[PDB]
From a paper:
The cellulosome is a highly intricate molecular nanomachine produced by anaerobic microorganisms to efficiently deconstruct complex plant cell wall polysaccharides, such as cellulose and hemicellulose. Finally, ScaA Doc, the unique member of group 5, binds exclusively to ScaB Cohs 5–9. This latter interaction has a central role in cellulosomal assembly as it allows the binding of up to five ScaA primary scaffoldins to ScaB and up to 10 more enzymes to a single cellulosome.
Here, we report the crystal structure of the R. flavefaciens strain FD-1 Coh-Doc complex established between ScaA Doc and the fifth cohesin of ScaB (RfCohScaB-DocScaA). The structure included two molecules of the RfCohScaB5-DocScaA heterodimer in the asymmetric unit, with each Doc coordinating two calcium (Ca2+) ions, as well as 1 acetonitrile and 225 water molecules. β-strands 9, 1, 2, 7, 4 comprise one sheet while β-strands 8, 3, 6, 5 are positioned on the opposite face. In contrast, the pattern of Ca2+ coordination in the C-terminal repeat is displaced due to the 12-residue loop insertion between Pro-693 and Ser-704. Helices 1 and 3 of RfDocScaA make numerous contacts with RfCohScaB5 β-sheets 8–3–6–5. The side chains of Val-662 and Val-666 at positions 11 and 15 dominate the hydrophobic recognition by contacting with the RfCohScaB5 hydrophobic platform formed by Ala-775/777 and Phe812/852.
Numbering used by the authors:
A (entry chain B): 644 to 730
B (entry chain A): 740 to 877
The structure:
Amino acid sequence: HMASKPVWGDVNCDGDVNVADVVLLNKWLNNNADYAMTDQGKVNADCFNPQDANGGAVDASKVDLTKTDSDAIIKSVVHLITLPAKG
Amino acid sequence: TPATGSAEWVIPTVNAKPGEKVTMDVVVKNSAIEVAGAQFNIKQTAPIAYGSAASGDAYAAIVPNETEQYYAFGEGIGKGIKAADGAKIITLTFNVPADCAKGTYPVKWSNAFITDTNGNKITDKITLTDGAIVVGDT
Ligand SMILES: [Ca+2]
Ligand SMILES: [Ca+2]
């Protein structure tokens, strides 16, 4: 599979969006090699200024992952916002 | 290899008079586990009113939903932190109405999920101890 739809915020691909996802993205953002993040995970993690906010299939090699993605995920976890976000 | 030990996270039991603003420091006891992140509700029993939440320095900065009294933290680079004993996870202020009847008003944890540095659930290793505001007289 060369592209995939995001389940927004589910970095670790376990079906839940929670602080495990935040922690693992923060770990990966800090150093890509510390977490074997999947192509699906990458697509899932890119929830701030994503490639396609209507939720169609996207390319994992064209994600833009930053700490702001993590900030959006943790905000979504406590229901302050819904994913995806922009700015 | 999920982080092995334990901690206890304690909402305190405090005395208060009707009309009083109450600051509750929620603290770590017997800290013996590295925690990377957590999410939880803490809710007070009526008619005690909710003021606000403030971050503690036990683990990581609190991201609060004040409407839902739903809170979360995640260490900025995904490291586990073994908090200092007695350190504040979160600080919650409440206000006791002047017409509050004498009694025990629980302040309780719920909907907790706690994670280690590798994304493993460690909620079971953390004892979540409810507290209370015990209202007396005026
Ligand atoms: Ca997840
Ligand atoms: Ca992004």
